[PDB]
Symmetry: C2
Subunit: 238 residues, 2 copies
């Protein structure tokens, strides 16, 4: 329903990066496109977000073809690229005001966005500190807050927990899970196969630009008699 | 059209042999399901022939669901398992009469089958010799003749050229190509990736029970800048 990818191909330079992949994401869930570095996850997530176009195949977001109706699609999505940063010479709350202003000019809408963001970030009084003082995990919470504050129907997050220590990765997972429990559909990319069971409801395993399996995390574990997703992946691709 | 496989899974014992595979075969072509030993090709070909049932997914042969209408499907197909043999203590022509008798009792139908078979086999006067005197390649031509003599709409051949020397493999390829040029749809399985360009119009590359690519042989070569299918396969799965 929420996202349907059908025989998606994408050439970049000499390479067929995506090799005719298919999968579907259900409304209201956290879906993981999971695989090692170089598998094509970023390209996939970027095509779904309308930033780049397919070479062929069809992608629909909530029933809207992303190539035929991109306008309608973009009204529904928010994309956060991997390792996004924020402007360091602003307070957190100031950064959030600034960016909220891209989306709207009305004080009311800006205020609403900023207050949603502050509440998602969970930075306490530190939101009034300069971003240059923030740890990596704080920047990441600020950025995800910023992606989520526009109340998208679908959030597309490229490696949301990469680079994070144990505590911050857990807080980020918490944020995403709460957001999905409030109705948000989230497409994440990740190469951390142990942690995927504690974040995603369903996954597509991707290898060299091919989907080698899909299902709920539990289905896959039961299907391959595997206690974790890295074992599934390994079982499936050699 | 001719065969459509959709999310086909099949468990055997502890193993998910087929891992939700999809592909389609066009009427009148030779299609190759291509991959190494153990990839799941025989199981696939057997499910399509109605001999074993899916665990899940859907297979249709000329629009007939093989699970809902197996009767209608079997009227359309002929399956030849890998390394099939013939009864050695009969003349070739005698073996062909005997087997034709399984399919029909009428002299006319038996005669027609036997004459089609003799013409496909191309064994000349050797068809009157005992099968015990036949070379491997002669047995193989006799068996393929036997599969094809019933005029199926779809022939499903499991590794039709395996074990064969250069000459006999070439004659078998000739037989299949001629038969397809006369309207027959042929599904073959093979692990000989160099020879697939000289037999198949389209292929699905299969690895560990997953389809990792599909297309015409030329499309795949052009897509992966590869001069042969073994290079494509290698490029695609690691």
């Amino acid at each position: 329903g929420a996202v349907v990818v059908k025989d998606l191909r994408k050439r970049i330079g000499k390479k067929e990066i995506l090799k005719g992949i298919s999968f579907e994401i259900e409304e209201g869930e956290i879906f993981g496109l999971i695989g090692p570095n170089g598998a094509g996850k970023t390209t996939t997530l970027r095509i779904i977000s309308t930033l780049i176009k397919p070479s062929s195949g069809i992608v629909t977001v909530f029933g809207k073809n992303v190539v035929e109706e991109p306008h309608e699609v973009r009204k529904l999505i928010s994309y956060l690229p991997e390792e996004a940063g924020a402007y360091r010479n602003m307070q957190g709350i100031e950064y959030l005001r600034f960016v909220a202003g891209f989306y709207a000019s009305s004080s009311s809408e800006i205020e609403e966005m900023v207050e949603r963001a502050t509440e998602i970030a969970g930075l306490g009084e530190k939101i009034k500190d300069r971003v240059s003082t923030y740890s990596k995990g704080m920047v990441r919470k600020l950025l995800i807050a910023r992606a989520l504050m526009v109340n998208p129907r679908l959030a597309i997050l490229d490696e949301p927990t990469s680079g994070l220590d144990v505590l911050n990765a857990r807080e980020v997972r918490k944020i995403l899970k709460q957001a999905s429990q409030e109705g948000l559909t989230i497409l994440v990319s990740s190469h951390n196969m142990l942690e995927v069971e504690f974040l995603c409801d369903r996954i597509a395993l991707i290898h060299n630009g091919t989907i080698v399996e899909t299902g709920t995390v539990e289905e896959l574990k039961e299907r391959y008699k595997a206690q974790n997703i890295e074992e599934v992946f390994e079982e499936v691709v050699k």
